[PDB]
Nucleic acid binder design. Structure first.
Ligand SMILES: [Zn+2]
Ligand SMILES: [Zn+2]
Lengths: 303, 97, 52, 88, 365, 201, 215, 179
DNA sequence: CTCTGCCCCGACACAGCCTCATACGCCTCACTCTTTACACACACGG
DNA sequence: CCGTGTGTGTAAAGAGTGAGGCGTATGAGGCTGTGTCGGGGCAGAGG
């Protein structure tokens, strides 16, 4: 009858279809947001970087400078966890240390004679004489003979006497990969790894002699004990053997006060059915975790 | 090598050798071979005695290169040696390869 | 997780095709709307010849 | 770490020049007094060192120096390497 | 703000914890859902009436829903499913390969450590935690005490309480670095122990998404973050816009942090721990309801205990360096062996060495 | 003038390429030696460039790395001499399309013909869909072959494809990520496989 | 381990019934002895871990984009699992904030559609306080889905589209000044809209079936 | 179109008019580069114009890096003055700009394949060697590096007008091959 | 058959853009045998 | 009938390699240019 009805009907149709596009375009936006989330998942990436150097340069990889508190703590000789970090000596490490010490001693002994030979050759180059040149040649032959004698030096006389100043810091540079400090290497070589330290298994007579010497001379001068033991042993080894064969190390008998102390420690440090005995033993005098386990399981638990 | 005989150590070497030669008890030769073997020894040890990591940042003021020797001059530099910082207004770096 | 990726992308193509069809629908609808406006102007101009 | 490095260098140099001192005809007393005067005399910021790679960016210089010595603020320091950065 | 993922399954967006708790409490406001009370024919009628009111159904409908929806061990198991069959095979293998079949130390430790305080009713009746308190299951990374800590990073989980002021967790984080004793006792080991590091260095700071909350509570405390911010202001460092706080005027609710994202906790100069907020949840009725001890430990790593190198029977009391007797440089001794080896009868420092008190990380942590 | 035709024949022998390509290479060498617009260049480099040009013209183009892998010179001078010869001879060579390099790359690998066609379709539909804008066709072919192998019964990791096509594994990774989301629609409609195409590394 | 498959089977064996009543889930539980999934010698630590894993699996199956039938089956599975636990401190279902509104709307839809069984199960799960209202579903450190097409186009949507189209054609027929023919200015109306959308939807259905059919 | 290239590099040459001892310049210059085993020139760098000058023993200096001819000439004069202060009779003779390289972006991806297909006689496109198409323009002797991202680099021009005319000549073709 | 001086070349920068392709390395993950540690247990012998 | 002397389970180190992702650095390309040092054909005696 009149297009006005057409106008209004088309308005309402456009309204409904535009609402349909509104819903559909919201779905499209959600789907594209999901796709962007997935892409960033592909581009995503950690904890380890933030262990000691929570802040580390994107250029160099170093942390913030030592604070005044850190410097004061270091001044008081308080060790960081890295300083107190101890690692076992592997057999390959021991062999490498031995060979490295041999090579270092060879180089140290060769350097002086090598430079002497070089100086003799340099003097020969500009001597402006013949008889003096022959004398210099004879001296060079003597130097070469000395170098050859040094080269053929046996390992026994080459190693040293476990107290001579080697350049142990070298052992920590070329042979080792920096995992071991110079002090650690030198102490290990001087005290334990040197051939002048008897690493052979202890004999019954040797153990008896060690016990007798410790009893007589006392258990408090173990250096003189090792010296008097006769065999080439370190004070550390003698003390270790004495302790491992000692009988007064542990009390081996329980008392009422000790029982009360153990019960108090257990009740204080329990977390339930779990009883960490190694941590209890810290306050316990002259006791082992096994003894505490036995006492708490057999004589301090109602049944 | 004519590079490491300029620090406090090398200057001490030069001064001690000068005092000894002026005392008329060593010859200049022994002095110069001693200096050469010192150069060799410091080259060996300095490259073989050390592991402390350092990292420095600054504003390079000037630089130079000739006959295989670099000469940098930097301003407002901070050197970062193990767990400690050194701030220097101006620093000269002389390298020789 | 690519199975969900392919399901999502196929749904994306589905809804893109639906949007393309409906956008053609709206473009032609608006063309019709302009035609209606022109025709109603022309028709209403036929009774304005006698006014106060 | 610098004092121990200097002591080691002194020990090495004196030990390996002992042979020349003996050969040329100067007694070891001269050698030991040289040592003693050496430590006695031991007691501008300049860095004498070795360069491994002087990388040049557009204007950023990345300095990969090998081992070297620095004389910063009247105090001697030593490094095995220096990975530094600068802007020209 | 709503907690939403930054990374796919690794990290969330930075949001205010207080707003998160407010949203949760408003969406559960007056629903009977936040009770914190112990679980409890007349009550059947009331339950049916409540069901009818909530579900728009008749009383008979509520009664039949209650009846039909009713609830619906014995080690023997037959007619096994997939998972049940796998479990049966695993138990058979364990029985045929194990001889004692008793709870191992680690499993009992972990279980009793997690379930140490669950449903533990407070004694005072005055430390009530409000209905909804946003308990944070934080975790503190253990400091590297053994070289292998890098391969597997140990951590201890702490159920902190929302709205609790900072320094409540800092005073609760148990670390061996706070018990270290400074000074050298080589000359004589009977010196009066110096004040533990907890007293000498009271300073510490948290760092949560570019904000240094410094522990300036005590006069002995100094601004630990200062250095860092200064060292950050010198040059472009990749870190910018550092903030500062006092750590005593803030609560965990006020923190705007992410979940699963590394944050820092520094103490005792440079002892750094990684704080990670695993998740945030409203307090339930089946967990600890206290406040005096609620900042407790949910899990700890049970570190190894160092032993005297001479005798392996006892733990370590002293650490010696540059010793003329020990094979290694950092040699650990007990009191007995240390006294026996490092001194004479009348009493004097034998040989050359530097001996210091050693606190076992495996005992106070 | 001699010792280059022998060198050209030796160059072809290592690739087992038909003789007509060798004849075309010799003819191109003759023309370039007549022009002498690149006299300073070594004869071996000219021969290698002529071999590459001849291989390109016949419709079985190779890659510069596969001419260098047989030649005694580096790819840099091979490309320099290629451009110099193209300029001096006032000749033209059709652009390399991805379709050329699968018939050989898949032949060196132990993939079946079905996987060959699948990879060809993937690489093509990728190139028309502009999923790999301005990237070397060899890398696109490597990525398509990687998809075809991973989805098919015979699986090849990136190292084998990189060695065969002479494309760094990182380049393969990048070109695979770029067309990674659009993997399914690139496969042929009728394609059988034992590992679903809806899951891939 | 490998519990997911079992749950899937249950869900499958529920959706195959095309039912929402909780009773059918009860007979399925009794037939498969699902309550025995926790039975068997196993210690408290791994017991609570396994309960946590099962509850998390059931909850994630209960959330979208799974079908309504699968969602109700997952809700019933959650109820059965939580009510049948051997841990003294019954493990709680971890519920996130972003999902709370969706679950509330799902419950509203369930009650509106007279699915009073699932509504009562959900209300009971709320009352006994079986939900840990966490920030994210899991601890952060370091199928039968629903497609958008049904939400876009369905039976009623196309029915009302075609009704509007028919009304539009009739009003076109009546608008023209002459009943013989409509005006030439308004003759662009298309009849292929329904045909086009039908072709597109059947193309999607064909793709889906040839996908889930293995090669 | 309304977009014009912005110059990125200008290479110019000048004759100082006297032989130089490169060793002295290296030892006395503030920022000189001299490695005789590596190259036979002294490379001096300055900050104000941000240019680099290679000075040869024969007295010919080559300045690069200037973004426009005024700065190139000023930098060349600065280098000449610096050499003069070093005790050399250096002058400023025969200053010539040898190259002017600029970059620009047409702001739409380009189909290189079709471009080379329809313009083979000028363009050389080798994706394996260089992922950019090389168009050897013939009216001005300018080389164009065109990339799929739309970046176009003009090189080989001696004056700025050559760069502008080359870009205006190439723009319609790129628009016709708009991807 | 075997060198052998000789003029006409290629290859070093380094100036600033620009995209893809190639290579180095560096911190962290995996796992795997091998011990390592700590609680608990089972005899064991007269 | 209460002592001890060896066994056992199972997570926790300890190296011991070995792999892998990603960030950075490098190359390749025409550009036009200037010193210079190797060097690749070139016929050429010379035997
Ligand atoms: Zn700590
Ligand atoms: Zn001891």
């Amino acid at each position: 009858e009149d297009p006005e009805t057409c106008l209004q009907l088309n308005m309402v149709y456009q309204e409904v279809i535009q609402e349909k596009l509104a819903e559909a375009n919201l779905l499209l936006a959600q789907n594209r947001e999901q796709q962007e989330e997935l892409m960033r998942d592909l581009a995503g990436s950690y904890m380890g970087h933030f262990m000691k150097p929570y802040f580390k340069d994107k250029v160099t990889g170093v942390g913030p400078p030592a604070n005044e508190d850190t410097r004061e703590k270091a001044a008081q000789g308080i060790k960081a966890f890295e300083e107190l970090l101890v690692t076992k000596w592997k057999n390959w490490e021991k062999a490498l240390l031995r060979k490295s010490v041999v090579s270092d001693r060879l180089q140290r002994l060769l350097q002086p004679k090598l430079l002497k030979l070089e100086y003799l050759h340099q003097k020969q180059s500009k001597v402006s004489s013949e008889l003096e040149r022959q004398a210099l040649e004879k001296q060079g032959r003597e130097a070469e003979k000395e170098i050859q004698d040094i080269n053929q030096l046996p390992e026994e006389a080459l190693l040293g006497n476990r107290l001579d100043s080697h350049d142990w810091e070298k052992i920590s540079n070329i042979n080792f990969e920096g995992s071991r400090s110079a002090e650690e290497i030198r102490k290990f070589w001087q005290n334990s790894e040197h051939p002048s330290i008897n690493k052979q298994e202890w004999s019954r007579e040797e153990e008896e002699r060690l016990q007798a010497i410790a009893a007589a001379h006392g258990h408090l001068e173990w250096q003189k004990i090792a010296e008097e033991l006769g065999t080439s042993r370190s004070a550390f080894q003698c003390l270790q053997k004495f302790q491992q064969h000692n009988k007064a190390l542990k009390r081996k008998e329980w008392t009422e006060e000790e029982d009360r102390m153990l019960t108090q420690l257990v009740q204080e440090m329990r977390v339930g059915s779990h009883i960490p005995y190694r941590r209890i033993v810290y306050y316990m005098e002259g006791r082992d975790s096994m003894q505490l386990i036995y006492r708490w399981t057999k004589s301090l638990d109602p049944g | 090598y004519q590079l490491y005989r300029n620090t406090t150590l090398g200057n001490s070497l030069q001064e001690s050798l000068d005092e000894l030669i002026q005392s008329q008890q060593i010859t200049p030769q022994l002095a110069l071979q001693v200096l050469l073997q010192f150069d060799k020894a410091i080259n060996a040890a300095l490259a073989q005695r050390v592991r402390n990591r350092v990292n420095f940042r600054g504003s390079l003021n000037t630089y130079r290169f000739c006959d295989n020797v670099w000469t940098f001059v930097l301003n407002d530099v901070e050197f970062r040696e193990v767990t400690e910082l050194i701030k220097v207004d101006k620093v000269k770096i002389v390298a020789c390869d | 997780m690519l199975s969900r990726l392919q399901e999502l992308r196929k749904e994306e193509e589905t809804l893109l095709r639906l949007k393309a069809a409906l956008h053609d629908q709206l473009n032609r609808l608006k063309v019709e709307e302009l035609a209606l406006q022109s025709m109603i102007s022309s028709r209403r101009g036929d009774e304005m010849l006698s006014s106060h | 770490t610098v004092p121990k490095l200097y002591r080691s260098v002194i020990e090495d140099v004196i030990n390996d020049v002992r042979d020349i001192f003996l050969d040329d005809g100067v007694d070891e007393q001269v050698l030991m007094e040289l040592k003693t005067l050496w430590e006695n005399k031991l007691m501008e910021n300049v860095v004498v060192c070795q360069y491994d790679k002087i990388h040049r960016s557009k204007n950023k210089w990345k300095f990969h120096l090998k081992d070297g010595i620095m004389n910063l603020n009247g105090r001697d320091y030593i490094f095995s390497k220096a990975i530094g950065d600068a802007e020209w | 703000n709503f907690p939403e993922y930054e990374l796919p399954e690794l990290n969330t967006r930075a949001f205010h914890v207080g707003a998160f708790g407010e949203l949760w409490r408003g969406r559960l406001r007056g629903a009977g859902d936040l009770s914190l009370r112990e679980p409890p024919a007349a009550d059947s009628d009331r339950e049916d009436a409540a069901v009818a009111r909530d579900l728009d159904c008749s009383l008979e409908a509520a009664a039949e829903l209650r009846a039909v929806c009713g609830l619906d061990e014995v080690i023997p198991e037959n007619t096994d499913l997939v998972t049940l069959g796998v479990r049966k095979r695993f138990l058979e293998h364990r029985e045929e390969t194990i001889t004692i079949d008793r709870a191992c130390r680690q499993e009992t430790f972990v279980y009793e450590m997690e379930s140490h305080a669950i449903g533990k009713k407070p004694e005072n009746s005055a430390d009530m935690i409000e209905e909804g308190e946003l308990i944070l299951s934080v975790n503190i990374l253990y400091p590297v005490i053994f070289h292998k800590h890098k391969e597997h990073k140990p951590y201890q989980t702490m159920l902190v309480l929302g709205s609790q002021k900072l320094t409540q967790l800092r005073d609760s984080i148990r670390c061996v670095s706070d018990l270290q004793i400074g000074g050298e006792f080589s000359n004589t080991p009977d010196q009066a122990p110096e004040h533990i590091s907890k007293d000498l260095y009271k300073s510490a700071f948290f760092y949560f998404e570019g904000t240094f909350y410094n522990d300036k509570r005590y006069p002995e405390c100094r601004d630990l973050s200062r250095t860092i911010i200064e060292w950050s202001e010198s040059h472009d460092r990749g870190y910018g816009k550092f903030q500062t706080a006092r750590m005593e005027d803030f609560t965990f609710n006020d923190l705007c942090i992410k979940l699963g994202f590394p944050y820092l906790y520094c103490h005792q100069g440079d002892c750094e721990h990684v704080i990670v907020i695993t998740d945030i949840r409203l307090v339930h009725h089946d967990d600890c309801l206290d406040r005096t001890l609620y900042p407790l430990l949910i899990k700890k790593h049970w570190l190894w205990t160092r032993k005297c190198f001479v005798c392996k029977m006892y733990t370590a009391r002293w650490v010696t360096n540059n010793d003329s007797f020990a094979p290694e440089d950092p040699c650990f001794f007990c009191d007995v062996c240390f006294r026996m080896l490092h001194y004479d009868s009348e009493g004097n420092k034998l040989g050359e060495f530097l001996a210091y008190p050693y606190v076992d990380p495996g005992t106070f942590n | 003038m001699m010792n280059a035709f022998k060198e050209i024949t030796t160059m072809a022998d290592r690739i087992n390429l038909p003789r007509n390509i060798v004849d075309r290479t010799n003819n191109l060498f003759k023309q370039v030696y007549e022009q002498k617009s690149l006299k300073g260049r070594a004869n071996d480099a000219i021969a290698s460039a002529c071999l590459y040009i001849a291989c390109r013209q016949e419709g079985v183009p190779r890659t510069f790395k596969e001419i260098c892998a047989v030649s005694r010179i580096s790819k840099k001078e091979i490309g320099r001499c290629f451009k110099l010869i193209l300029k001096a001879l006032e000749t033209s060579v059709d652009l390399i399309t991805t379709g050329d390099f699968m018939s050989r790359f898949c032949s060196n690998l132990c993939l079946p013909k079905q996987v060959q066609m699948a990879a060809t379709h993937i690489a093509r539909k990728a190139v028309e869909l502009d999923l790999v804008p301005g990237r070397s066709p060899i890398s696109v072919a490597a990525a398509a072959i990687y998809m075809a192998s991973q989805a098919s019964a015979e699986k090849r990791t990136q190292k084998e494809i990189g060695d065969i096509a002479g494309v760094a594994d990182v380049t393969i990774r990048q070109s695979y990520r770029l067309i990674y989301p659009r993997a399914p629609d690139l496969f042929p409609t009728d394609f059988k496989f034992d590992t679903p195409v809806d899951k891939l590394p | 381990p490998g519990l997911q498959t079992d749950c899937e089977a249950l869900l499958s064996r529920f959706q195959e019934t095309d039912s929402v009543r909780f009773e059918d889930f009860t007979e399925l539980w009794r037939n498969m002895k699902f309550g025995t999934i926790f039975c068997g010698r196993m210690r408290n630590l791994e017991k609570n871990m396994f309960t946590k894993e099962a509850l998390a699996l059931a909850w994630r199956y209960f959330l979208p984009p799974y079908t309504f039938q699968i969602r109700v089956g997952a809700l019933y599975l959650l109820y059965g699992l939580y009510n049948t636990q051997l841990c003294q401190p019954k493990q709680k279902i971890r519920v996130a904030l972003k999902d709370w509104d969706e679950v509330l709307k799902f419950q509203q839809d369930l009650v509106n559609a007279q699915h009073f069984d699932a509504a009562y199960i959900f209300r009971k799960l709320r009352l006994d306080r079986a939900f840990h209202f966490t920030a994210m579903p899991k601890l952060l450190s370091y199928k039968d889905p629903s497609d958008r097409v049904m939400k876009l186009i369905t039976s009623d949507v196309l029915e009302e589209m075609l009704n509007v189209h028919d009304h539009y054609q009739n009003m076109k027929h009546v608008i023209s000044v002459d009943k013989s023919k409509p005006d030439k200015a308004l003759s662009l109306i298309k009849d292929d809209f329904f045909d086009n959308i039908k072709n597109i939807v059947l193309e999607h259905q064909q793709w889906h079936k040839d996908r889930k059919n293995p090669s | 179109s309304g977009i014009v290239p912005q110059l990125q590099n200008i290479v110019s040459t000048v004759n100082l008019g006297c032989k130089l001892d490169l060793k002295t310049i290296a030892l006395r210059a503030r920022n000189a580069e001299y490695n005789p085993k590596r190259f036979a020139a002294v490379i001096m760098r300055i900050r104000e114009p941000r240019t680099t000058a290679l000075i040869f023993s024969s007295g010919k200096m080559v300045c690069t890096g200037a973004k426009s001819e005024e700065q190139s000439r000023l930098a060349a004069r600065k280098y000449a003055r610096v050499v003069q202060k070093l005790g050399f009779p250096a002058k400023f003779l025969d200053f010539k700009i040898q190259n002017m390289v600029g970059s620009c972006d047409v702001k739409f991806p380009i189909r290189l394949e079709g471009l080379v297909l329809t313009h083979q006689q000028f363009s050389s496109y080798e994706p394996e060697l260089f992922p950019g198409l090389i168009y050897r323009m013939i009216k001005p002797r300018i080389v164009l590096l065109i990339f799929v991202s739309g970046k176009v680099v003009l090189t080989g021009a001696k004056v700025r007008a050559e760069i502008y005319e080359a870009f205006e000549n190439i723009y319609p073709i790129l628009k016709g091959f708009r991807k």
